[PDB]
Amino acid sequence: GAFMQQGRSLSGRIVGGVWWFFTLIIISSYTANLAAFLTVERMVSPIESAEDLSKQTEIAYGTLDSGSTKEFFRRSKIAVFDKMWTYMRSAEPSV
Amino acid sequence: HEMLEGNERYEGYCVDLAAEIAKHCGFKYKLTIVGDGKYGARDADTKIWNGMVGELVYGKADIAIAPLTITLVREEVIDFSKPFMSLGISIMIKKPQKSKPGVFSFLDPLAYEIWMCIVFAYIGVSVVLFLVSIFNSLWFSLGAFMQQGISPRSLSGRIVGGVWWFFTLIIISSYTANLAAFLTVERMVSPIESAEDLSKQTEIAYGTLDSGSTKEFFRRSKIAVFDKMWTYMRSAEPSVFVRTTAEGVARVRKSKGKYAYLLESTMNEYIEQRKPCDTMKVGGNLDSKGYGIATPKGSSLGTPVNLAVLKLSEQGVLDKLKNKWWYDKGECGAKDSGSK
Amino acid sequence: YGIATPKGSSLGTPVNLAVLKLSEQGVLDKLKNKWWYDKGECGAKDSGSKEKTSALSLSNVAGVFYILVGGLGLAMLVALIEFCY
Amino acid sequence: GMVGELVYGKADIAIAPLTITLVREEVIDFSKPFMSLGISIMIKKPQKSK
Amino acid sequence: PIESAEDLSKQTEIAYGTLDSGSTKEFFRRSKIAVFDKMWTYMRSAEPSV
Numbered sequence: 001g002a003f004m005q006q007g008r009s010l011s012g013r014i015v016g017g018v019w020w021f022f023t024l025i026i027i028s029s030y031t032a033n034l035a036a037f038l039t040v041e042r043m044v045s046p047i048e049s050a051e052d053l054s055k056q057t058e059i060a061y062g063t064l065d066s067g068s069t070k071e072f073f074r075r076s077k078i079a080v081f082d083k084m085w086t087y088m089r090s091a092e093p094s095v
Numbered sequence: 096h097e098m099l100e101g102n103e104r105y106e107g108y109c110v111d112l113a114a115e116i117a118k119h120c121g122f123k124y125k126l127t128i129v130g131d132g133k134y135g136a137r138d139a140d141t142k143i144w145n146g147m148v149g150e151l152v153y154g155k156a157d158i159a160i161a162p163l164t165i166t167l168v169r170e171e172v173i174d175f176s177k178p179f180m181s182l183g184i185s186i187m188i189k190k191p192q193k194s195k196p197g198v199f200s201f202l203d204p205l206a207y208e209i210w211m212c213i214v215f216a217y218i219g220v221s222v223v224l225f226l227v228s229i230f231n232s233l234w235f236s237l238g239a240f241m242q243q244g245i246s247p248r249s250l251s252g253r254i255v256g257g258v259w260w261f262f263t264l265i266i267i268s269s270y271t272a273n274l275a276a277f278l279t280v281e282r283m284v285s286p287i288e289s290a291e292d293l294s295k296q297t298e299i300a301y302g303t304l305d306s307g308s309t310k311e312f313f314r315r316s317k318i319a320v321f322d323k324m325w326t327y328m329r330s331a332e333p334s335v336f337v338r339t340t341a342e343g344v345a346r347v348r349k350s351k352g353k354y355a356y357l358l359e360s361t362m363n364e365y366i367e368q369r370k371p372c373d374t375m376k377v378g379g380n381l382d383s384k385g386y387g388i389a390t391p392k393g394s395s396l397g398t399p400v401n402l403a404v405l406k407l408s409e410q411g412v413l414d415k416l417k418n419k420w421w422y423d424k425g426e427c428g429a430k431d432s433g434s435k
Numbered sequence: 436y437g438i439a440t441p442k443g444s445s446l447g448t449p450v451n452l453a454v455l456k457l458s459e460q461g462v463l464d465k466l467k468n469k470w471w472y473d474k475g476e477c478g479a480k481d482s483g484s485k486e487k488t489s490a491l492s493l494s495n496v497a498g499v500f501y502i503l504v505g506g507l508g509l510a511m512l513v514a515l516i517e518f519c520y
Numbered sequence: 521g522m523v524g525e526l527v528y529g530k531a532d533i534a535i536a537p538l539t540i541t542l543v544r545e546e547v548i549d550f551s552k553p554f555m556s557l558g559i560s561i562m563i564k565k566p567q568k569s570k
Numbered sequence: 571p572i573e574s575a576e577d578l579s580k581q582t583e584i585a586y587g588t589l590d591s592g593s594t595k596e597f598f599r600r601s602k603i604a605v606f607d608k609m610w611t612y613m614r615s616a617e618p619s620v
C-alpha cells in the first residue's frame with residue numbers, strides 16, 4: 001500500500017517520501033526512454049526512393065558486372081546517379 | 096606498383112595536377128623523386144640548398160609540383176606560381192561521441208538550477224502544513240508531503256496540497272519530456288571550435304611540432320590571443336611538442352580527448368577523412384598560407400605555367416580535384432557510424 | 436586579393452617580395468585585426484558562443500513556481516478568516 | 521578601372537582589394553595574395569529565444 | 571540549420587541568393603560539383619528572384 005501510491009511515524013514517513021522520488025524517476029525513465037524507440041520506429045525508409053538508397057552506406061547496392069545497366073550509371077551526368085556510380089566503383093568488397 | 100611502370104606508378108592530387116598543366120602547355124613530363132627527401136631547407140653555414148628547391152637552382156630539375164609552402168626566402172632564388180590551394184594553422188581534436196555516462200548526466204533532464212529550486216518548494220510547503228493545522232509536525236508534513244500534499248480539515252490546508260499537486264505535475268511532465276530529447280538526438284555536445292577558447296583552459300593540453308613554421312608563428316606573433324598561447328607552450332611541462340607530425344597525430348588519439356595538436360588545415364582535413372575516423376577540424380584556421388609551383392628564374396616555363404593554374408581554378412578544376420582525393424576517395428567511416 | 440603593377444615595371448618584383456615579408460612578420464594579420472575587429476562596433480558580438488544547451492531551461496519552470504507561491508500566499512490569507520469564524 | 525589606370529599609365533601601382541583573375545593576370549602583374557577569402561554564407565543568427 | 575553548404579541546399583524554407591552580376595553568380599553557373607550545381611539550378615529557377 002506504500003508501493004502503489006507515493007512511498008504515523010517520522011521514520012516511516014521519510015521512507016514514504018524517498019521511495020516515491022525513486023519510483024518517480026524510473027517511471028519517467030521508462031516513459032522517456034520508451035518514446036525514443038517509437039520515434040526511432042518512425043525513422044524507417046522503409047521503402048525509400050531510389051535517390052535515398054545512395055545517401056546511406058549501411059545497406060550496400062550494386063549492379064551486374066557488365067551490361068546495359070552498369071553503363072547507365074557510368075555516363076549518367078545526373079547528380080543522383082553519379083553519386084551512385086562513384087560509390088559502387090570504389091566500394092570494397094566488390095559489390 | 097611493381098606491376099606498373101613510368102608515370103602510372105604513382106597516384107595522388109599532384110599526379111593529376113601535372114597532367115592538366117602539361118595539357119594546357121603541351122609538353123611531355125616525367126615524375127621523379129627527390130633524393131634526400133627533405134625539401135626547402137638552406138643550411139646556415141654552407142648556404143647549400145637541398146631537396147627539391149636545390150634541384151631547380153642547380154639545374155637538376157626543370158619544374159616542381161608538390162605541396163611546397165610559399166615563403167620569402169624561397170622567392171629570391173626561384174619563381175613561384177600563384178597559389179592553387181589555400182590552408183592555415185587549424186585545430187585537430189578527437190570527435191567526442193559522449194556517450195558521457197555518469198552521475199552528472201543523471202540530473203541532466205532538469206537543469207542544475209531546477210534540482211536545487213524544487214527543494215525550496217518542498218520545505219516551503221511542508222512548513223505551510225505547520226501553519227495550517229515541531230518534531231511531530233515536520234514528521235507529519237513529510238508524511239503529508241509524500242502522499243501528495245494528513246488530517247487537514249481546514250480550508251487553508253486543502254488548497255496547499257492542491258497547488259502543490261499541480262506544481263509537482265508540471266515538473267514530472269517536464270522531467271520526462273526532456274529526458275526523451277537526448278535518447279533521441281545527441282550532439283553531444285562539446286567542445287568549442289575556436290582557438291581563443293582552447294587557450295583559456297589548462298585541462299586539455301595542446302602543442303605543435305618541435306621545429307617548423309608552426310612553432311615560429313606563435314614565437315614572434317604580436318597578437319594578444321596568440322601570445323598567451325606561446326607563453327603557455329614555452330612553460331608547459333611535460334613537453335607539449337612532438338618530434339614528427341606522425342607523433343602528434345598519435346598523441347591526440349591516445350589522450351582521451353585531453354590533448355590538441357595545431358597544424359595545417361590541409362593535413363587536418365585529410366586526417367578527418369581517414370581511419371579510424373575520429374579527428375575533426377574545429378574552428379577557422381589561424382593564419383593565411385598556400386602552396387605553389389616552382390620554376391627557375393628566367394626559365395621558359397615560368398609565366399606559361401602561371402597562366403595555366405589560373406585557368407584551372409576558374410573552370411572549377413582545382414576544387415573538383417580537392418574534392419576528389421579528400422572526400423570522394425576518403426575512407427570516412429564516421430559519416431556512416433554517426434548516422435546509424 | 437593582390438597588388439598590381441604594370442608588366443615589366445621596375446617596382447614590380449620589389450613590391451612582390453615586400454608583401455611576403457609583411458605576411459610572415461604578421462603585419463598583414465595584425466592590420467586585418469585593426470580595421471575589422473579592433474575598430475569594430477561589434478567587438479563584443481564576436482566572443483559570446485551560442486551552443487546547444489543540454490539541460491532544460493529554468494525560465495519555463497519559473498512560470499510554475501510563480502503560480503505555486505501565488506497559491507501559498509492566497510492560502511495564508513484564508514487561514515486567518517477561518518481562525519476567527 | 522584600376523587595372524585600366526595601370527595599363528594606360530595614369531598611375532604607377534594599384535593597391536586595393538583587387539581579385540586575382542586570369543583575364544587580369546594576362547595584362548598586368550599581380551603580387552602574391554595578401555588576403556585570402558572565399559564565398560560564404562551570411563545569416564541572421566536567432567534571436568529566437570524569448 | 572547547421573553551418574554547411576549542403577544544409578543550406580537541403581532545405582528551401584530559408585531561401586538564398588547572390589548578386590545579380592558578379593563573380594559570385596558565375597561560380598555556380600559553370601561549377602561541375604554536385605552540391606553547388608544543385609544550388610545553381612535552384613537559384614536559376616527560384617521565384618521570386620533571390
Ligand SMILES: CNC(=O)N1N=C(c2ccc(N)c(Br)c2)c2cc3c(cc2C[C@@H]1C)OCO3
Pocket residue numbers: 020023024025027028031260263264267268271
Ligand atoms: C495528473 N498526473 C498525476 O497526478 N500524476 N502523474 C504521474 C505521471 C506523470 C508523468 C507521466 N508521464 C506519467 Br506516465 C505519470 C505520476 C508520476 C510519477 C509518480 C506519481 C505520479 C502521480 C502524479 C502526480 O511517482 C513516480 O512518477
Ligand SMILES: CNC(=O)N1N=C(c2ccc(N)c(Br)c2)c2cc3c(cc2C[C@H]1C)OCO3
Pocket residue numbers: 025028029030032033193194195196200201202203204205273274277278489490491
Ligand atoms: C547511457 N546514458 C546516457 O548516455 N545519458 N543519460 C541520459 C539519461 C539520463 C537520465 C535518465 N533518467 C535517462 Br532515462 C536518460 C541523458 C539525459 C539527459 C540529457 C542527455 C542524456 C545522454 C547521456 C548523458 O540531457 C538532458 O537529460
